[PDB]
Amino acid sequence: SGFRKMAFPSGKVEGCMVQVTCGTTTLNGLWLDDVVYCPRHVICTSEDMLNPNYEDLLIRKSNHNFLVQAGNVQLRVIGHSMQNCVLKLKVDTANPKTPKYKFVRIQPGQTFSVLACYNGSPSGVYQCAMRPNFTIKGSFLNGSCGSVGFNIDYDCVSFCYMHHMELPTGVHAGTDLEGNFYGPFVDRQTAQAAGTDTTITVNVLAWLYAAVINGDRWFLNRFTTTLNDFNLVAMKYNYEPLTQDHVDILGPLSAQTGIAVLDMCASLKELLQNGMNGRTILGSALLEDEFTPFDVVRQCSGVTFQ
Amino acid sequence: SGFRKMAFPSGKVEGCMVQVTCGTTTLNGLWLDDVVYCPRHVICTSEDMLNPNYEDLLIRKSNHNFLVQAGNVQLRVIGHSMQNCVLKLKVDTANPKTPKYKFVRIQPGQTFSVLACYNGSPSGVYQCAMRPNFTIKGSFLNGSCGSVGFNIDYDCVSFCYMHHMELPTGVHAGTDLEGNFYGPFVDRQTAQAAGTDTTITVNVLAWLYAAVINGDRWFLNRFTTTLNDFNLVAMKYNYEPLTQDHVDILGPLSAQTGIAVLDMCASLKELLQNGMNGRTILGSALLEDEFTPFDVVRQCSGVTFQ
Numbered sequence: 118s119g120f121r122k123m124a125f126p127s128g129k130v131e132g133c134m135v136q137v138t139c140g141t142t143t144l145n146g147l148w149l150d151d152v153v154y155c156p157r158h159v160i161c162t163s164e165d166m167l168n169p170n171y172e173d174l175l176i177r178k179s180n181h182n183f184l185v186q187a188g189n190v191q192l193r194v195i196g197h198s199m200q201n202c203v204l205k206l207k208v209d210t211a212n213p214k215t216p217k218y219k220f221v222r223i224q225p226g227q228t229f230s231v232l233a234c235y236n237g238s239p240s241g242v243y244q245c246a247m248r249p250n251f252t253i254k255g256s257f258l259n260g261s262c263g264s265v266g267f268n269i270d271y272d273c274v275s276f277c278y279m280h281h282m283e284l285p286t287g288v289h290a291g292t293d294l295e296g297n298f299y300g301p302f303v304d305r306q307t308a309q310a311a312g313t314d315t316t317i318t319v320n321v322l323a324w325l326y327a328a329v330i331n332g333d334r335w336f337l338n339r340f341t342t343t344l345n346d347f348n349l350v351a352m353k354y355n356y357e358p359l360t361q362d363h364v365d366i367l368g369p370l371s372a373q374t375g376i377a378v379l380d381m382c383a384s385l386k387e388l389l390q391n392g393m394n395g396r397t398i399l400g401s402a403l404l405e406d407e408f409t410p411f412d413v414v415r416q417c418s419g420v421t422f423q
Numbered sequence: 424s425g426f427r428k429m430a431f432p433s434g435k436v437e438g439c440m441v442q443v444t445c446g447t448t449t450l451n452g453l454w455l456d457d458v459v460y461c462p463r464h465v466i467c468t469s470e471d472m473l474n475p476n477y478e479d480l481l482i483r484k485s486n487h488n489f490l491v492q493a494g495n496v497q498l499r500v501i502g503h504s505m506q507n508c509v510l511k512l513k514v515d516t517a518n519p520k521t522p523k524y525k526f527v528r529i530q531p532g533q534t535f536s537v538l539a540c541y542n543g544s545p546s547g548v549y550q551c552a553m554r555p556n557f558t559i560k561g562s563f564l565n566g567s568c569g570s571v572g573f574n575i576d577y578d579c580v581s582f583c584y585m586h587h588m589e590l591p592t593g594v595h596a597g598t599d600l601e602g603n604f605y606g607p608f609v610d611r612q613t614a615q616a617a618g619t620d621t622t623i624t625v626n627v628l629a630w631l632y633a634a635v636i637n638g639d640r641w642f643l644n645r646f647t648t649t650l651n652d653f654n655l656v657a658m659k660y661n662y663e664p665l666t667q668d669h670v671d672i673l674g675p676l677s678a679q680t681g682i683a684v685l686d687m688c689a690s691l692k693e694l695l696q697n698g699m700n701g702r703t704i705l706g707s708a709l710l711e712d713e714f715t716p717f718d719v720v721r722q723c724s725g726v727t728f729q
């Protein structure tokens with residue numbers, strides 16, 4: 118029993134974190150095989166980052182300009198190249214701690230674990246969702262660039278996020294490991310804003326199913342609703358539309374608890390229309406949307422990773 | 424910017440987890456140097472755990488009854504002994520991944536990270552507080568016994584918790600690594616209940632300071648209050664008393680933000696008396712109490728561990 122915002126064990130990623138220094142800038146890099154991946158704005162200076170021309174900035178660079186440190190062991194850069202918004206530093210040693218891995222790009226609505234890092238040293242781990250507006254509500258201070266987000270399936274690390282910047286609402290933006298930004302953001306210090314967000318509807322329903330599995334049932338009801346009449350209510354609470362695919366995803370949870378998906382939407386409808394009225398659900402006084410249907414089955418069933 | 428319930432990187436602990444099997448029971452053990460620590464109710468059967476006599480049960484045991492598996496490598500038990508509610512299995516190999524460590528017992532109100540484990544394989548990591556009633560609100564399924572809780576300071580792991588049981592309200596109880604229970608609980612399947620809980624007052628104030636550091640200020644006010652007049656209000660919202668020591672702990676946070684501790688108590692007083700009125704604080708609609716003043720400074724300053 119219980120339900121916690123749970124991250125993957127971070128060990129396999131901790132062994133890949135290194136410190137990358139170029140001149141005055143220091144940030145984190147990800148060392149897999151004989152390549153170190155890091156944000157390309159490491160080549161930038163303070164006066165550069167207002168409107169940089171990275172291709173120009175990089176041809177003026179040499180390998181020996183890049184100080185790569187894996188703990189207290191130096192790393193020798195033997196090549197470099199730009200891939201979109203990331204830099205790939207080829208080094209003379211392959212990381213013997215390289216796990217089985219994949220570079221995957223996730224969808225808004227999906228979750229992942231973030232290993233926050235400073236000076237190549239891991240600071241903490243936590244769970245995040247990719248917001249519908251392609252931002253993440255992280256916890257990042259200066260120096261955290263190059264920290265990565267990831268999921269683990271069995272023994273394989275699927276890297277999905279590298280941190281690049283903080284936006285003025287306190288939210289965070291970054292790239293997949295191929296260097297392509299999530300959302301309409303650029304690694305320049307120009308005026309940028311997140312874009313209006315919505316609540317991840319299928320995730321709320323998953324979390325309501327976790328609550329039922331854990332003995333919270335006060336929000337249940339005898340009512341029902343059609344998928345279209347629910348979506349009419351979702352649109353007005355700035356929830357995003359529920360699809361038949363989302364209904365299908367929620368199948369196992371519906372089967373496990375005996376509550377048809379559409380019945381749970383009737384519950385969400387009333388919760389949106391009435392609030393919670395001093396009650397809580399899974400220790401929260403808000404409708405939580407950063408748990409996927411997968412996350413719920415993971416935690417409410419006890420799957421591990423090896 | 425941002426504020427997340429953040430766990431320590433779990434790598435150093437992942438390398439210590441092993442699977443301990445005795446007859447029909449399988450649970451997790453903690454392998455440090457040449458000792459494996461695990462819950463003593465691993466020696467128990469189904470019919471045993473209603474009222475066991477562990478000393479009797481253990482003399483009927485031999486080393487070869489204990490199957491210890493470190494991944495897919497067997498471990499040879501060469502001795503065993505009971506220490507309070509934990510079992511210490513001496514094995515023929517020292518764990519070469521043994522980190523620098525300490526066995527520490529924490530206070531109610533303090534936090535720690537939990538590496539949830541099944542069959543010696545880590546499943547996930549999350550942050551917990553020790554409740555005033557000596558329970559923890561964890562996420563634990565059958566097979567999770569022997570999972571440990573811990574803090575990391577620089578390179579040293581201070582183990583503070585080993586999981587033993589779930590109570591009927593869905594909360595969890597366990598021991599320090601010397602085998603002594605937190606709270607009035609016993610590793611027997613007799614009727615037991617958690618005992619009435621309170622809210623950790625100093626932690627709420629710390630979290631209010633984190634909110635201010637992160638730009639939430641709507642709950643601030645010009646009022647003030649004496650420590651005694653606050654404690655009179657705390658007692659009636661079932662918050663526990665605030666001490667001058669707690670005021671002292673909150674000093675740096677008060678200095679960083681310019682809000683005297685007693686002024687922040689006046690804010691908490693009004694929040695208790697009025698609620699939040701549709702607003703949120705750090706993405707929560709409830710007053711959060713599982714962040715210590717240390718946790719806040721950690722996250723709002725960016726300290727790492729190596």
Ligand SMILES: *[C@H](O)[C@H](C[C@@H]1CC=NC1=O)NC(=O)[C@@H]1[C@@H]2[C@H](CN1C(=O)C(Oc1ccc(Cl)cc1)Oc1ccc(Cl)cc1)C2(C)C
Pocket residue numbers: 144158161166257258259260261262263280281282283284285289303304305306307308309310424
């Ligand atoms: C990398 O270590 C660092 C991590 C940031 C710093 C604090 N939290 C984080 O996640 N990233 C950066 O510094 C990037 C880097 C240049 C600018 N930048 C930003 O995150 C951010 O810079 C500011 C942050 C806060 C303030 Cl008050 C002012 C600037 O960039 C933007 C700020 C504001 C807008 Cl409207 C757009 C971008 C880059 C992007 C090369």
Ligand SMILES: *[C@H](O)[C@H](C[C@@H]1CC=NC1=O)NC(=O)[C@@H]1[C@@H]2[C@H](CN1C(=O)C(Oc1ccc(Cl)cc1)Oc1ccc(Cl)cc1)C2(C)C
Pocket residue numbers: 118450464467472563564565566567568569586587588589590591595609610611612613614615616
């Ligand atoms: C160890 O793997 C396991 C972990 C538990 C199981 C589910 N979540 C957990 O944290 N621990 C135990 O099984 C211990 C073990 C014997 C009993 N026990 C309990 O956690 C618990 O057992 C029950 C759980 C749920 C129900 Cl519906 C019924 C029993 O023990 C108690 C239950 C109820 C009371 Cl009032 C008191 C104890 C022990 C304690 C030797």
